[PDB]
Design a protein around this ligand. Structure first.
Ligand SMILES: Cc1cn([C@H]2C[C@H](OP(=O)(O)O)[C@@H](COP(=O)(O)O)O2)c(=O)[nH]c1=O
Ligand SMILES: [Ca+2]
Length: 135
């Protein structure tokens, strides 16, 4: 795996962000995690949805340098969203969210599991701390 530069365009919610990647605007969805819903009327505004959103926004907006890291499997979902680990000044947004108890490990499939144990450990620790979602 390798990290590639990208530029923030807009934070959309906890786990979805719009980036400039290789000169073209693209929506990215964070690999191996799920933040709670804030947009879809089916699920409603889920608990910690706004908090996950604000955390991701601050993390990406405040960063000097954004990088995307594709995994070894499928690189886009069915909705055209790029699937990657996003880093803000070298810190993984996906891991930060899980460790903060603001996303759960989810959707681990289609070859994209390089960071699974890293993220599962973060989750176990957030759970032990009864932090946010696990409170
Ligand atoms: C994270 C991730 C999500 N998805 C899809 C599965 C879900 O599709 P369906 O909604 O069609 O079931 C959706 C969950 O993302 P959201 O949490 O952004 O809704 O995104 C993937 O296909 N691959 C992935 O790696
Ligand atoms: Ca989500």
């Amino acid at each position: 795996l390798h990290k590639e530069p990208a530029t923030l365009i807009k934070a959309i919610d906890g786990d979805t962000v719009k980036l400039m990647y290789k000169g073209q605007p693209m929506t990215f969805r964070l690999l191996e995690v799920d933040t709670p819903e804030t947009k879809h009327p089916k699920k409603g505004v889920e608990k910690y949805g706004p908090e996950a959103s604000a955390f991701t926004k601050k993390m990406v907006e405040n960063a000097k340098k954004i990088e995307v890291e594709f995994d070894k499997g499928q690189r886009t979902d069915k909705y055209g969203r790029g699937l990657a680990y996003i880093y803000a000044d070298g810190k993984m947004v996906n891991e930060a969210l899980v460790r903060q108890g603001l996303a759960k490990v989810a959707y681990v499939y289609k070859g994209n599991n390089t960071h699974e144990q890293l993220l599962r450990k973060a989750e176990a620790q957030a759970k032990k701390e009864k932090l946010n979602i696990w409170s």
